[model samples]
Every structure is written in structure tokens, then in C-alpha cells.
Target: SNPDTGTGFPGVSSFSADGSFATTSGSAGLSCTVFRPSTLGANGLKHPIIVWGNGTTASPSTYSGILEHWASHGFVVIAANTSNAGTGQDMLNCVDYLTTQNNRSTGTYANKLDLNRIGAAGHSQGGGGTIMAGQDYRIKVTAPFQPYTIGLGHNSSSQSNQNGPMFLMTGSADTIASPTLNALPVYNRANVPVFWGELSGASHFEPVGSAGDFRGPSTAWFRYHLMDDASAEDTFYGSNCDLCTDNDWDVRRKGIN
Candidate 1:
């Protein structure tokens, strides 16, 4: 399938000014862009990592917007083309590949990536992949943006008991995944911290940075958890800003100790 090609749709329009490009091992050679800090030097401070999964068989380019934001805050953001326009484990493999990088005893990135601070997120079936990869115990945080799962009854992977944090966002009017059906199960059982945000009158793509700063809240999320930037927490938990109100979006937080 073709890469996503719209403004504000995650990776579609976002790329770091100093990002280094790399590819993972996969059929058709799955590619990824590693956004590194400009000031990175020998003995540089290690940073947190975030793995992104694109919507079902969609192009990774579509999510550049959100990925870029994470990169801006000193994180090694890896957005995978999990679909490669087909069904398989490209997304999961991407996580495995990154684990290898973080485990590298010596390299440019080396152990510089906080393997324990890993976060996983995706859109559509890619969102489902977030949960699937989380089962590996490598993913510490999971966020599924308007996900479409294979039903909690199918090939059940008990993640709720795994004690991992999860965040889910859906459109009130989503017809494809149907927030009530697809996202609710995962939302209900997430063991650690969980968050649910519904965009009033929003479609599946509405809260996904399809418009003005839709990623502002998501950016705050990455900063708070991935970067440990207390200041960024304001965007995720504080009052709605012009950007949030403009989109008629509201976020609900739950299960965080």
C-alpha cells in the first residue's frame, strides 16, 4: 500500500530536523527514521524510546506528525510500517528489532535507549498490534488510537494482568472500529494506568492530528511518560487549551497510581 499523504496525520507531515534514517530486517525491507537529539555526543545521555504502529496496512508516512513531536523532545521515535500494506507481524517484528538495538552493548545508540521505558502505540489494526507486542513484556506502555482488534476472544493474550499501562482514544462517531465494540474491551481491562478520550462528533481520523494541533495532547503524553518532562504533563492532564477546544476533544484519565 501507499504511504499516508495528508497534513497533520502523524508521520505524514512530520520529520525531525536531525533524524537519522535506518531500516529493520523484514520482507520488502521495513524502513524507519530514528530521530536523535542534535546535541548527542559520545557519552551522551540516554533517552527513552517510543515505537509507533501505523493504521492497518496504511503507509507509515501518515503518522510522521505525531512521531516527529516525540523526536523533538529527545526521544528515539521509531514508527514502523507494520502493515507493509498487508497482514502479518511487521509491527511486532519492528519492536523486536528495536529491542535488539536497545540491547546493543556498544553502538551509536547502544544502551542509550531506555529499554525499560518503552512505549507502544498504533492506529487501526496497528493499534491491535500494540497490544500484541505488549504481550512480549518488552512494551511498558501501550496506546491504541481508534484501534480495531481481532476481538478479545480470539487468540486471547492476557495483557490486563500483565500490569502494563494503556491509553485509548476513539471518535464518538467512529463507524469502522466502533469505539463501543473495538476499543472498549481493551480500555476496560488495562491493568496499570489507563486513559480514554472521546472526540465529540469526531470520526476515526479526527483526533489523529488530521487537523490543527490534534497531536498536542498526544505530544504531552509522550513527554510526560517517555521523556519524564513534568512540564509536558500539563498538556495531557490540565485544562483544555485552544487546540483541545477547537477540536471538541476531551481526555479522561484513570488507573494511574
Candidate 2:
């Protein structure tokens, strides 16, 4: 169950009913916490699944600020610890888990999940993993937050098989996931709808949502992908606030255009 401490942020719940999804720390072995939102609508309707990768925190809870916000807005956010210092290979495990559930009892989770709409997002190494994973998984959408390296050049055919869209968010001030070295390569290769948000005065942490910021654009990306809502797309790509202009957010709708 969610602790609901509201420790880091307010108005966000920690767990969902049925205790199916929420942050849970493992007692033995590699400890990992899973935070999911409650079922949406009165019909026990489910939204969609969006598995995430953390930047430097492996515990998953560290990203609760953004994860919870996504969940509250209706998304089964699965965040896992990839590395000891928040850089590891555990991300595939989260994907495996979601796929297994999707394949088993398709209707059991059908109320909440749109099996056809799968997405992935991450930071740093995980950000690269997003491209690596999304390329083949046939994921409808993907967003990686400033990654280092993208592909190891395996199954190169998958590079052109983009079934949906992708968004690459980077910081002009980020030296770690240098926009030139890391992000541009994958951005150039993506064959589907693509968006590049180069944030000014915003480091990698600015998008984390812990600083009174919401991944509102990121959220709109998935919402449009899963629900096919035009409003969501407008919010994601259209200019609105100071942050959008300051970041040099650019949009290009691939194949769909």
C-alpha cells in the first residue's frame, strides 16, 4: 500500500487500491519499489502502461514525484533500478514484467491498460535504453531524457521499424548527456514523429518535476498516443508557457503528418 506520506510532494497518493500497484521495497534480493495509480473512472477503467528508468536513483521511489503525478493522471508507471548507482540492466526486467502481464489474461488488466499502446522513457543510460528497447518492442511511443549512448548496433533492422513516435528532451546546460554527442544521433535516426525540447537554464533535474515542474509535455505525449486525443497533442506540441519557449521545444510529426 502507498504510505501516502506526501513527503516530497503534496496532493499525490502513494498507493492504489487492491494493492496491485504502488511503491513496494523488496525485503530480500535486489530491492525494488513499484508505484501504480488507482483504477480510473467508475467502470474500473485502466489507462495504459508506461515503464520508466531512473537517472541516478535505483530505488524507484526517488522518481515518485513524477511517477505519482503520471499515475494520478492515469498511467501504470513501472520504474525499476537499473544500476547500483542508478545505471544497470534491470530495465529489461520491467519490460518483461509488463509484457508478461499483457500476454496473460489480456482482459484482466484490459480495463486499465491499452495493450496496444506501450511506451518507455528514461534518463542517462536508461535514456539510451529507451531507444534500444523501443526500436524492437514495437512500442508506440518513447521519450528519453538526455541519454549517453543509444544503440550497440544490434538488430539494426529495428532502427527503421518505428511504429509510433518519439520525443527527445535535453538540457542546453547538461554536460552529462551532451546534446551533441548523445541525443542528436538517435534523434536523427528516429523514423516516426519526433520532438526535441532543448531546455535553457534547465539541467537534467529540471524536468524531474521535483522542482515544482510537471512532465506535462511528456504526459501529453502518452495521453495522445493511447487515447488519440487532439487536445493532448495540442498541449504537448503547441506553445503555452514560458518554459516551452525557453526550452526551444521543437515538434515534427513523422509518418503521421
Candidate 3:
């Protein structure tokens, strides 16, 4: 069985539960601190990509745990290494970087990257970057955790060219980026399918190591959107939608059942 394709975190064929996490440097406008499974092109499946941004004053190292968790699930995570990433320019450039590598016949990423399946996610200002980057034609999905909407285009296209889905996660007790001010309004305005999940009593810092309660749902989201993992459908859609009833999360949805 393809363990990582399951609903929750799962171990791979020979890698640990989070994969044999490894790091590398990537080139983008802001450079990148990339996290990937030590083994790429595993199971003959080209890995999908997730471009990430960090909150103000934070680098990729600031949120290494959760990025590693995603890489374990077989997604190549390219995070901009900058303390100022709200503009989304860095995130978009990262996508271009990966595309070039994927196209380079002699490059390590050749024939190993799924260019069609792309995603963007971040925390705080980085979360805002998710929205800004989401406007790009290439971004297929977005999850802006506790974002502050101080972006180049505040609340621009809650919808991308492909009508890519969105995941808006926030903390109930966070004063830094209040859900009411940051996540809720965006959810209400999104033209595409959107999900807003609030972690109970979670702080703005909750998305750091291992991503706390935000981990599973967000993981399920990328799996459903980028990997087309049917098992993930129940977490965000249909009668058995798990997040809709889970106590840890106060949720809302639109354009999704």
C-alpha cells in the first residue's frame, strides 16, 4: 500500500514516518531552504510541489518541523528564506525555480516533479503570502495559516485561474492575527471552494514544530488537492466530513459539501 496517501500521517516503504527528511538550498528571488524526502521519484510517482513562505522575521528554519512532515508525505517543500515574504514575489519565483529544474534533462528534478500539482502555504505574513501567491495562475491550492492580509493585493483573487481550492486555518485565541480579521473575512469572500479551520485555544505560534493541531487537516487538504488522494475527501467534503464535526476545530465551508 502507498502509506503516505492515507488520511493521516503514514510511514513510507523504507523511510521513517516523516520520510528520511533532508534539506538543500534552492534558487529563487529570495533564495530557498528546501525540504524533501531523501528519496525522490519514489514508487514511480512524481512528487508534487508546495511553495512556502514564513511569517515576518522568521526563516524556513523557524518552521522546519512541519515542512519536514510534509516532505515525509512526498511533497517537495520549497520555502523562501527571508524575514520579509508577504509580497508573494518570492513564493512565485520559487515555483519558477522548480519548473526549470524539472525541465532540465540533466537536473536531479528531471522527470521527478509533478508540475500540474502545485500548492502554496504559510504562516502569519507568510500566510498572507499564500493569498498573494494564490493569485498566480500556477498555484493550484492555498492554505494561509493565521495570515495577516497586509499584502500587495489584500484579499485579491480568493480564486486562481484553475479555481484551485483554498484552506484557511486560524487559531481561536490568537491575538496576533485574529481569526475574525485575518481568516474569517477571507473565507467569506472566496469565490472558490474554501475551508476555514480554527484550532481551539491555539496561539499564533502553534503552527511551528510539527504544526500542532493544524497538521493533520492541512496535510489531508494537500493530499486531496495536489495528490488526488480519494481518502482525503471525507476530511473536507461530503456527509462524513471529519473537520466539520471535530471538536478541536471550529469549521466553515463554501462551494464544498
Candidate 4:
């Protein structure tokens, strides 16, 4: 069930303190699931956008929990419903639709979207799509979890085209797409700011549940990069960066200053 407006949950931030229902819609030959605050214009601020892609053979519903969680935190998330998102065209189409809608004066999203601040994210094969989508200059940040590229016929060289900062996460226990083989090469090829983490004991499927462990860092990343929230910077920067000192995570980085 969706959380009622103004409802806050433990451990979540005050900005996302309210609950909101997600709306389902479609455009550009694709189905899109949108998550956003129920009440608009009350804050006098446009919401940042996050474009999402699902894992192989999965729909947006498969990652609805995290997507909605981001919305609850004051973001507008547009997730595409296509198992064949490896090409990243569907995700781009979602962005195009919203970009057009934000320009209209009568639509639900009229002038309500912050096009200057945008991010991309996904899991597994969708993670690869996130990487592919990063090629679009409009995206300011990206977070790819347990990213698998074989499905997209992509190689590490694909990272050369990424346009902004990236946070790459993987589970040490994931045998399906070994980090050493798939994620490492991608991380090594990153020319922009990059943060990589290998979660001990976690697996490929661990990120699928309702706002699971990956939610905190992910939210913080978008808050820092997309929203420019200073408080969230401490989570990933400096000598004593939060994720840097966490014992459960094997963290690495480059060009993050």
C-alpha cells in the first residue's frame, strides 16, 4: 500500500518525510511508472528526476519499492516497463516524454520537473542500461548495481562514453555476474568521479526488496549529486566518508573530490 501524504518512516529523511502515491502512465511506445509527491506547487520547487530500468526480463514493478522510496524523498522517478531495455532507447524515450511534459502548461507535470538535475539507475542488466543511458549529457549522475553488460553486447570500453559521476555497487556473493569480471572493468574505465562498493554476503537478488539496504546510499548519492544537498556529501566524501569507513563494505574510489 502507498503511504499517506505527510507520513514519515523511521531512518528516512525529513525531505522525504511525506508519503505519496505513484502514478502509472505510458508514452513514446513505452509504459512508464511515475513516483512523486501527491501535492505539487506547495513547496515552490521542482523535483529532480530519476530514470530507471529493470533487471533482465523484469518490469518496473519489480523495482517499485525503491522507485517509490525515491519519490517519497521528493523526487520524480520515471521507470520504463520493458525487459528489453538493454539498448537504453526505452529509458531515453521516458526522459524525452517527461522533458516535453514539463514544457506544457496544462499537464500534471507542467513546469514541475527539474530537467537540469537528473540521474539514472538500475539493477543487473538494467544496470548496464543505466551505464548506457549515462551517455546522454542530460544525466548528471548514475548508480549501477550488480551491472551486467553481456546482455547488451557492451564491453568495458562502453564506460568511456559516460557523461557524469557514477557509483558502482556489487555483491561479493553474486555469482551470476561476477564483479571481478563485469563490474571491475567498467569501474576501471570510468573517467568521471566513481565510487565502487562490494557488499559482503549480499547477492544479485538482494536489491529487489522493499527499500532494501541499497536505498540509503543510493538516496544519498542523488541528494548529493542531483539536488546538491551539502549534508549528503559527507556520506561519500572526505577521509572519514561514511561508506568509506563502513566495515561491511569494501569501498574504492577515483576523482570524487
Scored by lDDT, the top model is: 3
TM-score of every candidate: 0.72, 0.71, 0.88, 0.88
For candidate 3, which ten residues in a row score worst on lDDT?
7-16
For residues 1-257, could you state the per-residue lDDT of candidate 4 as single tens digits?
A: 42222212212343333334344333323467776666544456777899988888788778877887787767788887887676677777878988998998788888878898889998888888888888889988999988998666454555988999999989999888789887988888888889997888888887784536677888878877876766677888998898889988899998874
lDDT of 3 by residue, 109-211 (tens): 8888889889999999889888888877789899988998745345445433224788989999999888887777678677778888888999999987678
User: Model 3 clash pairs?
Assistant: 18-72
Candidate 2 lDDT, 1-257, residue by residue in tens = 32212111111222211223333222112433445554333344545667677765434655667667566655667776654322324555665665665556554343445556668777766676666667645467887777656333223333355555777777778877688877676667777777766666557666554322337667666666754544454454554533345435544333333
Regions of candidate 4 where Cα sits further than 4 Å from its true position: 1-30, 153-155
Model 2's lDDT to the true fold? 0.56
Cα lDDT of candidate 1 equals: 0.58
State candidate 3's TM-score: 0.88
Instruction: Estimate the TM-score for candidate 4.
Output: 0.88
State which candidate, 1 or 2, has the greater TM-score: 1
| Per-residue accuracy of model 1 over 206-234 as CA lDDT, tens digit each | 53533223365555555456555544444
Q: Number of the top candidate by TM-score?
A: 4
Better of 1 and 2 by lDDT: 1
